[PDB]
Design an enzyme around this catalytic site. Structure first.
Site, PDB file in Angstrom:
ATOM      1  N   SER A  87      -3.433  10.690   1.407  1.00  0.00           N
ATOM      2  CA  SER A  87      -2.722  10.409   2.617  1.00  0.00           C
ATOM      3  C   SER A  87      -2.451  11.756   3.312  1.00  0.00           C
ATOM      4  O   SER A  87      -1.953  12.731   2.691  1.00  0.00           O
ATOM      5  CB  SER A  87      -1.479   9.551   2.371  1.00  0.00           C
ATOM      6  OG  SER A  87      -0.829   9.360   3.617  1.00  0.00           O
ATOM      7  N   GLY A  88      -2.847  11.839   4.584  1.00  0.00           N
ATOM      8  CA  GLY A  88      -2.649  13.062   5.315  1.00  0.00           C
ATOM      9  C   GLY A  88      -3.792  14.064   5.111  1.00  0.00           C
ATOM     10  O   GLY A  88      -3.812  15.154   5.726  1.00  0.00           O
TER      11      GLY A  88
ATOM     12  N   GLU B 179      -4.890   6.861  -5.975  1.00  0.00           N
ATOM     13  CA  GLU B 179      -3.472   7.013  -5.687  1.00  0.00           C
ATOM     14  C   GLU B 179      -2.703   7.064  -7.010  1.00  0.00           C
ATOM     15  O   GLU B 179      -2.675   6.084  -7.768  1.00  0.00           O
ATOM     16  CB  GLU B 179      -2.853   5.784  -4.975  1.00  0.00           C
ATOM     17  CG  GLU B 179      -3.362   5.568  -3.547  1.00  0.00           C
ATOM     18  CD  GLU B 179      -2.655   4.500  -2.779  1.00  0.00           C
ATOM     19  OE1 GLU B 179      -2.020   3.563  -3.216  1.00  0.00           O
ATOM     20  OE2 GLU B 179      -2.816   4.695  -1.528  1.00  0.00           O
TER      21      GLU B 179
ATOM     22  N   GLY C 188      -8.504   7.805  -1.508  1.00  0.00           N
ATOM     23  CA  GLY C 188      -9.176   8.033  -2.804  1.00  0.00           C
ATOM     24  C   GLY C 188      -8.142   7.504  -3.844  1.00  0.00           C
ATOM     25  O   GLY C 188      -7.248   6.694  -3.495  1.00  0.00           O
TER      26      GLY C 188
ATOM     27  N   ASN D 219       2.518  11.678   6.519  1.00  0.00           N
ATOM     28  CA  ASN D 219       1.742  11.771   7.714  1.00  0.00           C
ATOM     29  C   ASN D 219       2.444  11.018   8.811  1.00  0.00           C
ATOM     30  O   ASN D 219       2.921   9.918   8.587  1.00  0.00           O
ATOM     31  CB  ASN D 219       0.385  11.044   7.312  1.00  0.00           C
ATOM     32  CG  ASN D 219      -0.808  11.109   8.250  1.00  0.00           C
ATOM     33  OD1 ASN D 219      -2.047  10.995   7.913  1.00  0.00           O
ATOM     34  ND2 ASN D 219      -0.437  11.329   9.483  1.00  0.00           N
TER      35      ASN D 219
ATOM     36  N   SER E  38      -0.005   7.581   9.673  1.00  0.00           N
ATOM     37  CA  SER E  38      -0.668   7.082   8.492  1.00  0.00           C
ATOM     38  C   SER E  38      -1.325   5.738   8.650  1.00  0.00           C
ATOM     39  O   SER E  38      -0.726   4.848   9.213  1.00  0.00           O
ATOM     40  CB  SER E  38       0.369   6.962   7.424  1.00  0.00           C
ATOM     41  OG  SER E  38      -0.242   6.667   6.218  1.00  0.00           O
ATOM     42  N   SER E  39      -2.531   5.630   8.098  1.00  0.00           N
ATOM     43  CA  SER E  39      -3.225   4.353   8.060  1.00  0.00           C
ATOM     44  C   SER E  39      -2.732   3.574   6.842  1.00  0.00           C
ATOM     45  O   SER E  39      -2.932   3.992   5.714  1.00  0.00           O
ATOM     46  CB  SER E  39      -4.731   4.485   7.871  1.00  0.00           C
ATOM     47  OG  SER E  39      -5.287   5.642   8.530  1.00  0.00           O
TER      48      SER E  39
ATOM     49  N   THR F 219      -8.963   9.846   8.676  1.00  0.00           N
ATOM     50  CA  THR F 219      -8.953   9.198   9.975  1.00  0.00           C
ATOM     51  C   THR F 219      -9.450  10.107  11.084  1.00  0.00           C
ATOM     52  O   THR F 219     -10.306   9.772  11.921  1.00  0.00           O
ATOM     53  CB  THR F 219      -7.565   8.659  10.276  1.00  0.00           C
ATOM     54  OG1 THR F 219      -7.216   7.702   9.313  1.00  0.00           O
ATOM     55  CG2 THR F 219      -7.606   7.902  11.547  1.00  0.00           C
TER      56      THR F 219
END
Ligand SMILES: Nc1ncnc2c1ncn2[C@@H]1O[C@H](COP(=O)(O)OP(=O)(O)NP(=O)(O)O)[C@@H](O)[C@H]1O
Ligand SMILES: [Mg+2]
Length: 737
Positions: A180-181, A451, A449, A225, A228-229, A185
């Site tokens: 994340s971050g 977690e 990827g 982030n 974030s998605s 994206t």
């Protein structure tokens, strides 16, 4: 020509700056170094120590401090010669040890070179600041260039996928994964942008425009982030046989519905909520019964209602316009927001009970408010929430729910609304852009990827399950490609996977599914079944020493401990039938779809896990038909700061993401594979009688080798390249002219 113009920004921002010399000579030095952990506990922290002496078996070096230490040559982390500092492909390093790899990455990041290849991968480290390498002029430069002709860039791999597509008449895939971050994206958006340009605008516009629509509804500010998605995606960019974009399709996964009803401190709910509340006309608000976010439970609980350097109102305009572009009728648009609105109200309902035990509604305001915008019936809603009729054998009786239970049901309703709505938007968009009759596609996968959090639940198992499959995919891919190369020159995950998705014996999901049929099963029955089948019985499983709610899985990235709480409910993802009923009647034209369309209101009878499994298998099936491209996006630190590349943060990602493994494997063989001519031009001077420019490069290569007396076991004459084992080229590079 930017690539040739040393003053171009291309040079500035994408290359290691080049001086006036080629000359091997400049780089001459006597010092040899090793990378050492100046603190054996803190093993990712390394310092460079010069080797002051050696034994036949070890080395003796001085530390920073002037502290001599010794090491076995076999445990040594030899430092590559400075000429290798900054190479564009880690495949070019002679000494391929972890500290070596991070150092090359680091040398690059220090010059703001965020892209580096590692064999098959494109490693991308988040800069956490703007670097102007995504311009149209930047685009223009990657056109038709080979990997080897240009600097590493996302545009570069996108170019290669596109040419391969045209040339091999084969579908392609770009898999963009990481934390994340990490910037998945951002890169994803660049790949599309690039393709839109090389291969393209009306459709293009809509295609581009689809994104923002999805990010408004599926992205949120988290602590990792600001944008974030909260869902994973697979974008299929469609082309006709001529190589022009013909359409597109989007597949979404694992949307975090829970965020709708709850958010951790400092986080936000999905963007759309704020954009609506901010950008809605003063006259839209009224019709919608809206106030400030502070006025809503679903938005006033985290402390954060705004993102720095972000205008929700400006953003709303941008979302609205995107919908405008894609084709949502105003009618549509309205109901969308009405739904967003309705959801807000639903959260505002306060349940009270004390009259009995079962809940009641003293204030029907929020209730009335919701029903209105939804176009459903307040009394029906009301009942459906606190007094659902429930199948208890032969009889169907209305149950009077308490507050908690009442409250949780309301939440379930909110989450279904949101989930279904998201689904629907996806559908609506595909409708517009998607091709039945398409020729080729390039699909982009943007998802996390592995977690490994503090707390890991059902969702982390899912994502980590996808991830074992993708890693096994890479691995297989690497295998075939490595074999071909070797062939062109005359030179597991299954157990984990099975533990999770096995049918017979049953794996975790099958057990979970089994437990699912029993209305009265519990987290405890579930976890006990799991340990009964796998504790000391399955090598990838671990029953904890004390916790009674967790279990461990040894994954590719290492052990992950999961907690079982609520798995049964997640698997079933229940919604009271009366609520369906309520909503199936809605007078809202968008609403009735969410509940009347089976493709939207339903799974397949199948559980959440069974659906997950199935969608992952389709995904893999598709991928299996493409030529794949791998991008590993790396977060430099946990603070969202530029110029701050933390070895521990970094190393850990390279360990988990397959980058270091790829290298360790590759390291064991013939890692350095150089073009004859290339070799000679830089080393001719090392031997007697070798002109830089020799027509017989291969013969020339043998001269140097022989001149040098290199050990023939260390090198391998390929039909076009010389293959060199690890360390070889370094030594060589280390030779006298
Ligand atoms: N090349 C880049 N240049 C500049 N900023 C970038 C770049 N890549 C990412 N960022 C920045 O880092 C933030 C996070 O990037 P982003 O691509 O959203 O990460 P992610 O991997 O998709 N995270 P998540 O959806 O939560 O798993 C962006 O919003 C920018 O602030
Ligand atoms: Mg993202």
């Amino acid at each position: 020509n930017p690539i040739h113009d040393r003053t171009s920004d291309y040079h500035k921002y994408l290359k290691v700056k080049q001086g006036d010399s080629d000359l091997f000579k400049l780089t001459v030095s006597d010092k040899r170094y090793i990378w050492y952990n100046p603190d054996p506990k803190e093993r990712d922290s390394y310092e460079c120590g010069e080797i002051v002496s050696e034994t036949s078996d070890s080395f003796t070096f001085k530390t920073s401090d002037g502290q001599d230490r010794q090491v076995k040559k076999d445990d040594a982390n030899q430092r590559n010669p400075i000429k290798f500092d900054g190479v564009e492909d880690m495949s070019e390093l002679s000494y391929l040890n972890e500290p070596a790899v991070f150092h090359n990455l680091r040398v690059r990041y220090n010059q703001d070179l965020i892209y580096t290849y590692s064999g098959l991968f494109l490693v991308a480290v988040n800069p956490f600041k703007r670097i102007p390498i995504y311009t149209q002029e930047m685009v223009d430069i990657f056109k038709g260039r080979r990997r080897n002709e240009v600097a590493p860039h996302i545009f570069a791999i996108s170019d290669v996928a596109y040419r391969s597509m045209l040339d091999d008449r084969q579908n392609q895939s770009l898999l963009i994964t990481g934390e994340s971050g990490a910037g998945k994206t951002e890169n994803t958006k660049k790949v599309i942008q690039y393709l839109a340009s090389v291969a393209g605008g009306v459709l293009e516009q809509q295609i581009l425009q689809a994104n923002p629509i999805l990010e408004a509804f599926g992205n949120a500010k988290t602590t990792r982030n600001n944008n974030s998605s909260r869902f994973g995606k697979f974008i299929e960019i469609q082309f006709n046989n001529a190589g022009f974009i013909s359409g597109a399709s989007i597949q979404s996964y694992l949307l975090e519905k829970s965020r709708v009803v709850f958010q951790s401190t400092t986080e936000r709910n999905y963007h759309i909520f704020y954009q609506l509340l901010a950008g809605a006309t003063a006259e839209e608000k009224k019709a919608l019964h809206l106030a400030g976010p502070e006025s809503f439970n679903y938005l006033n609980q985290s402390g954060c209602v705004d993102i720095k350097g972000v205008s929700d109102e400006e953003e709303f305009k941008i979302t609205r316009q995107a919908m405008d572009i894609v084709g949502f009728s105003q009618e549509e648009q309205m109901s969308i927001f009405k739904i967003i609105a309705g959801i807000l109200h639903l959260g505002n309902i306060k349940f009270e009970k004390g009259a009995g035990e079962g809940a009641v509604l003293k204030d029907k305001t929020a209730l009335n408010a919701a029903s209105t915008v939804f176009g459903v019936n307040p009394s029906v809603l009301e009942k459906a929430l606190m007094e659902p009729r429930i199948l208890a054998g032969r009889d169907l009786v209305a149950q009077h729910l308490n507050v908690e239970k009442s409250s949780s049901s309301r939440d379930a309703l909110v989450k279904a609304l949101y989930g279904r709505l998201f689904l629907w938007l996806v559908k609506k968009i595909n409708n517009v852009l998607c091709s039945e009759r398409k020729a080729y596609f390039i699909g982009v996968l943007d998802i996390s990827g592995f977690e490994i959090f503090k707390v890991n639940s059902f969702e982390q198992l899912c994502i980590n399950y996808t991830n074992e499959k993708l890693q096994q995919f890479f691995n297989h891919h690497m295998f075939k490609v490595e074999q071909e190369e070797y062939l062109k020159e005359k030179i597991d995950s299954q157990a984990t996977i099975d533990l999770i998705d096995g049918r017979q014996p049953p794996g975790i999901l099958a057990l979970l599914d089994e437990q699912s049929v029993f209305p009265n099963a519990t987290d405890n029955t579930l976890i006990t079944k799991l340990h009964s089948h796998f504790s000391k019985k399955n090598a990838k499983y671990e029953e904890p020493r004390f916790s009674k709610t967790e279990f461990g899985v040894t994954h590719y990235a290492g052990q992950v401990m999961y907690e079982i709480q609520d798995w049964l409910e997640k698997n079933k993802d229940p919604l009271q039938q009366d609520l369906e009923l309520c909503f199936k009647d809605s007078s809202d034209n968008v609403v009735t779809k969410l509940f009347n369309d089976p493709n939207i209101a339903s799974r397949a009878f199948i559980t959440v896990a069974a659906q997950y499994k199935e969608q992952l298998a389709s995904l893999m099936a598709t991928l299996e038909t493409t030529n794949p491209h791998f991008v590993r996006c790396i977060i430099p630190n946990n603070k969202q700061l530029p110029a701050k590349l933390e070895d521990k943060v970094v190393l850990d990602q390279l360990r988990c993401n397959g980058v270091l493994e790829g290298i360790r494997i590759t390291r064991k063989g013939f890692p350095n594979r150089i073009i004859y001519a290339d070799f000679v031009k830089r080393y001719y001077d090392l031997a007697p009688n070798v002109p830089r420019d020799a027509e017989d490069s291969q013969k020339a290569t043998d001269a140097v080798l022989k001149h040098l007396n290199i050990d023939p076991e260390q090198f391998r004459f390929g039909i076009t390249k010389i293959f060199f084992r690890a360390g070889q080229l370094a030594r060589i590079e280390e030779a006298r002219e």
